[PDB]
């Protein structure tokens with residue numbers, strides 16, 4: 001109950017919301033049908049429109065008017081945005097030459113520059129170029145401030161997941177808004193776009209920017225706007241709040257536009273009808289900047305122009321129907337559209353098997369426009385698994401397509417020509433970022449970055465300490481003139497051992513044989529020095545990674561590679577090696593095909609054995625430093641050490657072998673050498689974080705050799721590809737991946753063909769940031785470079801996406 005008999009006289013858009021049954025006058029009241037009787041009259045005035053005209057100039061203050069052209073208006077702080085233009089001969093902000101803002105030029109009493117976030121739904125990255133003739137205000141911001149070519153959203157590329165990721169710096173899996181539709185099985189509740197359950201605070205995890213601000217003594221303007229409140233009134237309210245007394249005035253504000261997303265759904269991303277929504281957004285931006293300039297705040301305030309996601313061409317004829325794959329289509333529930341989530345309709349039905357459902361959706365048509373997944377097999381870059389609200393079965397839908405349950409759902413519910421929600425690496429889903437103001441840089445292009453990073457930056461812009469989040473704080477320091485956060489390297493927790501020769505061949509009973517019984521003081525002293533670390537400068541280019549958890553490990557040196565060997569997991573955590581442009585691939589000789597050799601620096605009890613692999617019919621084994629790239633027949637023996645061995649399913653070996661035999665050399669040619677660091681990953685609980693020993697669900701049969709869920713590689717070279725990887729004076733270039741370690745290749749529908757037609761394609765899909773790999777291994781890479789740490793942080797968040805321009 002709301003007793004709406006109270007009034008909004010003097011309370012219009014109040015910043016502290018009052019509790020029922022008292023009526024409300026805040027900018028959300030409309031959405032809860034709880035405004036006071038007079039809210040429309042007093043707070044949503046529209047009389048005489050939104051602009052001063054010559055004849056209104058100097059008028060008598062009429063309080064009924066939407067905005068005022070009277071003489072007193074400036075001091076009341078309620079002029080129309082164009083008042084000084086029309087009535088005082090000033091220019092519009094867009095017509096002024098832009099001039100560097102080296103320091104905040106703010107009115108007295110302002111304790112910090114305010115931050116205004118102008119968020120636009122569906123603003124696809126390519127509109128900045130393609131709509132440039134009709135968006136002059138936005139184009140001034142972009143060219144005079146700091147901008148990226150695009151900003152990467154989070155998956156799913158839907159509105160609520162992305163706006164709340166912008167607000168918190170969290171992946172949807174961690175903040176809880178994992179879609180626009182959701183079911184929580186612990187609550188036994190459903191979250192929808194329509195209706196009231198979305199207003200319950202239990203859905204919304206983490207700490208959004210406005211609560212972070214409030215808690216640390218920074219006043220926040222309320223971020224949300226009810227849909228019926230027109231844009232012009234949202235702007236005027238923000239400008240009103242900026243006129244307030246120093247002790248009541250907020251330091252951070254948000255504007256939200258439902259365009260261009262709303263139109264984009266009807267007319268498609270580039271429909272001729274889309275020009276007009278872009279004109280109107282630009283007009284609104286123009287009103288803000290004109291308003292700020294009136295208040296002498298235009299060289300004081302930091303303005304962020306940011307989108308949540310883009311828009312793709314999607315029509316009703318491009319729908320895949322689960323009814324054309326599943327006989328049992330009525331026993332499931334489908335969250336449909338640009339992604340698919342499948343659970344059982346009834347939890348009482350114990351004859352619901354997700355495996356047979358997955359199998360019925362796998363490679364069944366030759367052009368199939370979706371791929372099903374257990375959520376824990378989704379690419380790790382999506383971070384879309386560790387939440388009870390995300391269904392075990394997921395469908396990644398091809399760009400331009402939909403998935404529905406049955407045809408009746410598509411015609412009983414063609415209307416739309418645009419949609420979004422696809423994989424966040426897809427170009428059409430990319431969105432925008434511009435930063436403009438004293439704390440941002442002048443006329444600066446920055447590289448593409450992910451929207452998870454902005455929460456930290458907005459905290460920095462407001463002098464706030466950010467709540468724990470998934471940004472990498474410091475990775476966007478290059479956007480800022482000052483206010484930068486100065487990060488330190490995390491301290492190494494476990495120092496390594498450096499074992500020498502401590503064991504005789506005969507102490508090992510591994511069941512491993514090798515054809516290596518063949519016999520010199522020139523090449524004996526020389527090989528010792530390789531085992532003590534003479535070529536380590538060659539193979540470990542960026543320092544050894546730091547282990548950031550408590551564990552027991554050994555650094556092992558060799559001619560061609562260097563490893564940090566875990567005595568706990570009985571395999572390397574990492575293997576580092578460099579392949580120059582001119583290095584040569586060789587084969588595995590016939591005498592060494594099944595050769596595995598004891599490592600005399602590591603005890604039998606901390607080594608693997610071959611009998612485990614013999615007795616495990618499912619599990620085979622592979623190598624982290626590839627024998628294929630040994631530098632000499634003598635060096636090749638080092639690659640067959642038991643300490644270079646890792647468990648591999650025969651299906652994964654096809655992948656690994658192709659990567660090691662062909663691709664590594666291919667990349668070395670194309671990039672002028674590469675440093676490679678490869679290793680195992682264990683994420684049985686799919687939280688994106690290194691598992692402890694006691695979380696490992698699978699061992700090689702009859703042993704304590706744990707089985708990785710994934711294998712990673714980090715491939716680094718010189719950004720200036722004229723210089724070789726091993727002699728690079730400048731910025732680095734990196735690409736990486738996290739391959740799921742799977743016993744079949746069902747993910748790759750063309751896997752029965754030659755590895756040259758699908759392997760590289762699989763790797764692309766499972767491309768990763770170094771930072772992803774850090775979370776999963778508890779390692780810290782690039783500890784010793786000649787580069788700044790911020791630059792390295794930027795490099796660690798880089799994702800190689802494999803999309804075109």
Ligand SMILES: *[C@@H]1O[C@H](CO)[C@@H](O[C@@H]2O[C@H](CO)[C@@H](O[C@@H]3O[C@H](CO[C@H]4O[C@H](CO)[C@@H](O)[C@H](O[C@H]5O[C@H](CO)[C@@H](O)[C@H](O)[C@@H]5O[C@H]5O[C@H](CO)[C@@H](O)[C@H](O)[C@@H]5O)[C@@H]4O)[C@@H](O)[C@H](O[C@H]4O[C@H](CO)[C@@H](O)[C@H](O)[C@@H]4O[C@H]4O[C@H](CO)[C@@H](O)[C@H](O)[C@@H]4O)[C@@H]3O)[C@H](O)[C@H]2NC(C)=O)[C@H](O)[C@H]1NC(C)=O
Pocket residue numbers: 170171173174175176202203204205206383386387388468469470687688689775
């Ligand atoms: C992205 O960044 C985020 C943010 O930094 C990272 O997530 C953090 O990971 C931490 C490590 O896993 C995690 O720390 C745990 O916190 C537990 C207390 O959590 C509450 O308090 C925080 C702080 O205010 C709050 O934010 C939490 O909110 C979560 O949960 C509610 C649901 O109840 C949601 O509303 C909210 O959206 C959020 O959900 C997300 O996180 C939870 C996990 O916290 C997931 O389950 C969800 O799926 C969702 O992703 C909470 O209200 C604390 O209890 C944990 O401690 C246990 O484990 C330690 C290990 O050291 C052990 O020693 C302790 O004994 C303890 O175990 C006890 O409970 C066990 C299970 O019941 C039991 O086995 C034991 O026997 C014990 O009884 C732990 O310290 C932190 O909460 C989250 N934070 C967030 C916001 O998600 C994330 O890792 C980053 N991602 C990547 C890839 O880097």
Ligand SMILES: Cc1nnn(Cc2cc(C(F)(F)F)ccc2CCC(=O)N2CCN(S(=O)(=O)c3ccc(S(N)(=O)=O)cc3)CC2)n1
Pocket residue numbers: 028031117119159160161163164165166167168198199200201204223224225226227254255256306
């Ligand atoms: C979603 C979402 N998550 N965070 N935001 C705030 C946000 C964040 C940014 C930023 F991160 F800075 F970029 C910019 C602009 C906005 C405003 C977005 C907006 O005005 N709308 C329209 C209104 N609704 S609503 O569904 O009616 C609704 C009402 C109340 C609640 S509650 N329970 O939190 O009180 C929840 C939903 C959400 C979308 N929206």
Ligand SMILES: [Ca+2]
Pocket residue numbers: 682683684685686687688689690691
């Ligand atoms: Ca884990």
Ligand SMILES: [Cl-]
Pocket residue numbers: 156158178179180181335
């Ligand atoms: Cl959804």
Ligand SMILES: [K+]
Pocket residue numbers: 613614615616617618619620
């Ligand atoms: K085997």
Ligand SMILES: [Zn+2]
Pocket residue numbers: 122159261262265420
């Ligand atoms: Zn939309």
